[PDB]
C-alpha cells in the first residue's frame, strides 16, 4: 500500500550564517520606515531590495548576547555564493558599488526551518 498512496518524492549552516538570513528576510518584506518602533501578506509577492548597512542594523539587534568584524562579512559573502540572496547584477558583480542593492532569495518554507533551529520567533514579526 506504500507504493500507490504517494509518489515517493523522486529518489549544517553556521550560527552567523543562520542569523544573517533571518535579518535579510525582514529587510526584504518590511518597510524601513517603521523599524524604529520594534527593534528600538507581503510574503506572497517578490521581495524588496535593501542596503548593506540596513541589514547589519537588524542583524545586530536580533543577535543574542557584537560588532561588525570580518567574520560577519565572511558569512555574508558566502550567503551570496549559494544563491541564497539575490542582488541587482548576475555576472560580474561589484560588492563595493553603492548603487548595487541586496535582497533575499529564499522561500518562506526554507526560512521557517532555519529560525526554528536557533529558537527564534520569526512568525511574530509579520503577524
Amino acid at each position: 500500500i506504500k507504493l500507490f498512496l504517494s509518489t515517493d518524492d523522486n529518489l549544517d549552516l553556521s550560527i552567523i550564517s543562520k542569523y544573517l538570513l533571518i535579518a535579510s528576510y525582514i529587510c526584504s518584506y518590511l518597510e524601513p520606515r517603521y523599524d524604529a518602533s520594534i527593534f528600538s501578506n507581503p510574503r506572497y509577492l517578490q521581495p524588496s531590495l535593501f542596503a548593506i548597512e540596513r541589514l547589519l542594523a537588524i542583524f545586530q539587534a536580533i543577535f543574542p548576547i557584537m560588532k561588525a568584524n570580518i567574520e560577519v562579512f565572511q558569512n555574508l559573502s558566502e550567503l551570496h555564493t549559494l544563491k541564497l540572496i539575490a542582488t541587482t547584477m548576475n555576472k560580474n558583480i561589484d560588492y563595493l558599488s553603492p548603487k548595487v542593492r541586496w535582497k533575499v532569495n529564499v522561500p518562506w518554507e526554507i526560512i521557517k526551518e532555519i529560525s526554528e533551529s536557533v529558537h527564534f520567533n520569526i512568525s511574530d514579526y509579520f503577524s
Binding site: 548593506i52 545586530q60 553603492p98 526554507i110
Partner: protein, 542 residues
Amino acid sequence: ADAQRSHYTVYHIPFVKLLSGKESEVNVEKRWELYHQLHSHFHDQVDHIIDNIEADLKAEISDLLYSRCFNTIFLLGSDSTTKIELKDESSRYNVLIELTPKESPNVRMMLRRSMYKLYSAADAEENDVSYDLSLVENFKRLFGKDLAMVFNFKDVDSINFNTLDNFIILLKSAFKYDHVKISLIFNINTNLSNIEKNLRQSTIRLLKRNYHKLDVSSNKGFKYGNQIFQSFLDTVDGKLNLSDRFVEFILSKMANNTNHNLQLLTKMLDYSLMSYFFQNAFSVFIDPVNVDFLNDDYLKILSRCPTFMFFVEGLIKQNRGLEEFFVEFLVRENPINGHAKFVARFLEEELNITNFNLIELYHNLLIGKLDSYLDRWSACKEYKDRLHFEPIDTIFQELFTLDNRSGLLTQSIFPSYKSNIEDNLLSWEQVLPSLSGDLDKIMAPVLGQLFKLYREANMTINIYDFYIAFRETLPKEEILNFIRKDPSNTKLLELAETPDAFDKVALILFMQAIFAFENMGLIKFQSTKSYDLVEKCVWRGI
C-alpha cells in the same frame, strides 16, 4: 614619470632582540633554528594529511562511478578542487570533461567545448570533424573503441540553471547508441533542496534513475579535522601546552566557516607559534641543552608568574636555590596531550564513535569538565571512571604556552575591520602623539574633523551646509598665519592677500576630504550630473 603613469614594474634574521635590548646575540640565532624544528615537523604531518584527503576522495569517487540512464553523483561540500583520475580499461576510452561556469555562457558553447576536449583526448592516445553531437554517434566508426564520457560540472551553484537544464536534455539523446555512457558529476556547495526547485520536472525524474549521494565537506563527521589538531599536539608533547582561551577562540572561528575551515585552522595554529618565538624570551629553555644559559634578567621574569606566586605564598604560611628549582621542574612530560589521544582512540575503535571532534574534546579536559561531554552519547556509561582525569596546574606554565588575552590573535586574523575605521577617525587622540607646532595642537586634522560632523547628522546631508560647519571649527587667525610661513613660494603669499583667502582654503580641504570619504565607502552621492546631496552608509557601533 612613474608617478603619472598607470602601472609600472620595478626590478640577517627577522627576529629582533628581546630582554629590553640586553639579550645576547647567541640567543637570537638559536631561536630561529628552534622555531624551524616545530614549523617543519608540523607542516610535514599537515602535508601528509592533505595528500591523504585526496587519496580517499579519489578512491570513494571511483568506487561509486563504475559501481540507459545518467550516473549522477552529488558531491555535497566540494569546492571543485579535486583532480578526478579515471581508469584505463581495455576496449573502452574514458574521457573526463570539466565544465566551468565562466566557460559556459550559453548552450551552443557548452557542446562545442565538450567536443573539443573529447576529440583532443582521443587523438593524443592513438581529418577534421565538426564539434557537435555527430562526433559522439560516429565515435565507433572513427576509433573502434567504446565511449564513456564523465562530465564534471565544476561549481554548480555559480552556473545558471537555465543553461544546465538544456544541456542535460541535449545529452539524453545519446542513449540510443548502445555504446555511449554519460556520467554526470555535480559539486553542490549548498543543499540538495536548493538545486531541485531550479530544475524542470523532466530533469529531476530523469536523473533520479541512478543518483547517489557522496557528502565530502571540509569537516565531514569531524574526521579529517581531528588529524590536524592531533599533529599540532604531538610536536609540543612535553614542551608547550594549550590554554583554555586558545581552544575557545579556535572553536569560535571554525564554526563560522564551512566550505574551507581546514585551512583556517592551520593559519591560527601557525600564527600562535610565531608570536611565541618572537615575544616570549623563554623560548630558548625548551631544548634540554640550552638550559644553563641563565642570567640576572631571566630570573627576574619567571618570578612574576601568577601560578608561581601561589606556591611561594603557601610555603611561608605553614639566588642559588631558585636556579636549581627551575631547571629540575621541567623534566616532567605533563600528561596533558597524550591522554587526549587515548580517549580519541578508545571511542572510535572500541565504541565505534566517529561523530566526535578533537577540538571540543581537548577543551573539556583543560577546564576539568570531561564528564559533561562524554555523557552526551549515552554509550560510555560504564567507562566513566576509566577515562577520568584532572588537569594539574603546574607552576610557570604560562611562559611556555599559547594563550590569547591582550587581543594579539584577535587583531591579526579576525579583527574588527569596520570598527577600527570609525574608532581611529573619531578618537584621533589615541593614534596621533600628543607632543607649525601651534596649528597641530589647536586645529583638528581634515580627516578627523570631517568624521566628527558626519556621525552627528541625519541620513540626508547637504554639502552646502557641511562646508559652513567645517569652516566654523577652523580658526581664522591661525590659518592665515600658517600659510604665510613659506616665503620661498611666491604664489602662496599672493593668495593670502585676497580677502576671500580663508573661504578658499577651507573649500579645498573640504573637497579633498569628501572625495577621500567616498573612496572608502563613508558617503554616497545621488545623481551623476548633480553633485548636491550626500547620504550616509557607515554607522559607528553596529
